[PDB]
Amino acid sequence: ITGTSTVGVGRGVLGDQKNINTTYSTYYYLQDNTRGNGIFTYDAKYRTTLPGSLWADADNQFFASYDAPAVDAHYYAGVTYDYYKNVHNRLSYDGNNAAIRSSVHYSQGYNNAFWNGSQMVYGDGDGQTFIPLSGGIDVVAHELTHAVTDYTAGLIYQNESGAINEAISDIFGTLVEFYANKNPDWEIGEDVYTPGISGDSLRSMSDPAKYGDPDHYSKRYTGTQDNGGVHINSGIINKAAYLISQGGTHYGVSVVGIGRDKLGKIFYRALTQYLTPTSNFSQLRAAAVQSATDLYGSTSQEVASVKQAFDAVGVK
Ligand SMILES: [Ca+2]
Ligand SMILES: [Ca+2]
Ligand SMILES: [Ca+2]
Ligand SMILES: [Ca+2]
Ligand SMILES: [Zn+2]
Numbered sequence: 001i002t003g004t005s006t007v008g009v010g011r012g013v014l015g016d017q018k019n020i021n022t023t024y025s026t027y028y029y030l031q032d033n034t035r036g037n038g039i040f041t042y043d044a045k046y047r048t049t050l051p052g053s054l055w056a057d058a059d060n061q062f063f064a065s066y067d068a069p070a071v072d073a074h075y076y077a078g079v080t081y082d083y084y085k086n087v088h089n090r091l092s093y094d095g096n097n098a099a100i101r102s103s104v105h106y107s108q109g110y111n112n113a114f115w116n117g118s119q120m121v122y123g124d125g126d127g128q129t130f131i132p133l134s135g136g137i138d139v140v141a142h143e144l145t146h147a148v149t150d151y152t153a154g155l156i157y158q159n160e161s162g163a164i165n166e167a168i169s170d171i172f173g174t175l176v177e178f179y180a181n182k183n184p185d186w187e188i189g190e191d192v193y194t195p196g197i198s199g200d201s202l203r204s205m206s207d208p209a210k211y212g213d214p215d216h217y218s219k220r221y222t223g224t225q226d227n228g229g230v231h232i233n234s235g236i237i238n239k240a241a242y243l244i245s246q247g248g249t250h251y252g253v254s255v256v257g258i259g260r261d262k263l264g265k266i267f268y269r270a271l272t273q274y275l276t277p278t279s280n281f282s283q284l285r286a287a288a289v290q291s292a293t294d295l296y297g298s299t300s301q302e303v304a305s306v307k308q309a310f311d312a313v314g315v316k
Pocket of ligand 4: 190194196197198200
């Protein structure tokens with residue numbers, strides 16, 4: 001809508017208070033005019049029609065329980081935008097400040113969130129498996145990262161290319177979580193998954209096998225479930241990414257860690273320069289090796305560690 005940029009205040013899904021950029025014209029809308037062509041957050045009203053209604057509020061205070069998923073979807077979209085801009089000099093998901101749209105209260109007790117090719121969509125969860133999924137900064141950045149992928153490599157959401165797609169979203173979701181310095185870790189969805197159980201998450205990057213995901217290519221899922229194991233075989237790449245950043249030994253292969261900033265640079269370059277819609281794990285290795293070479297030189301520690309990380313997960 002047309003109006004004036006304002007700043008409201010509310011509480012997120014975790015009960016945390018934060019300021020949010022809004023727009024005033026009769027109502028205060030969840031519309032942040034400060035980032036690119038804007039960040040817009042919508043109410044899906046428990047339906048599956050999209051986007052729903054642009055979120056409108058009478059007083060610019062967002063403290064109702066119903067407000068919470070909207071506050072977080074809106075806020076964390078902004079943080080993710082800031083990450084890509086400040087860290088990778090990327091202006092929104094298309095690199096041209098495209099408007100970012102999110103819908104919350106999607107369906108009834110919906111235990112998921114997604115990027116649908118046009119916007120982000122967040123369920124509220126059933127209150128057992130999940131609380132509203134926008135409450136997770138890694139979740140929001142994971143979903144927004146699918147948009148980045150859509151506009152760059154275009155990785156097909158199937159088999160090895162789909163597993164890389166997923167891993168890319170987990171990697172950058174985690175890097176955004178560290179960027180925000182908001183209880184960061186190498187797990188996915190810990191802030192919104194199973195409110196009855198502390199310490200668990202949907203996926204682990206540091207140890208994918210913790211939750212049954214493969215941490216070596218020989219252990220890859222070969223069947224047809226989950227689009228050919230896109231959230232399963234992502235474990236192999238997530239493990240590689242973890243090792244590149246943090247180092248460690250894994251299946252008797254030693255990896256010297258080069259840190260999060262360099263992991264980000266190498267995978268961002270891979271994604272934007274070398275990966276294609278049908279890239280497989282072997283091609284990701286080559287893309288990451290080439291990227292590290294462009295950035296740090298072919299005899300660098302950075303290149304050596306990429307090779308060792310991929311060696312460790314059995315990807316040649
Ligand atoms: Ca209000
Ligand atoms: Ca965390
Ligand atoms: Ca996390
Ligand atoms: Ca939990
Ligand atoms: Zn995903």
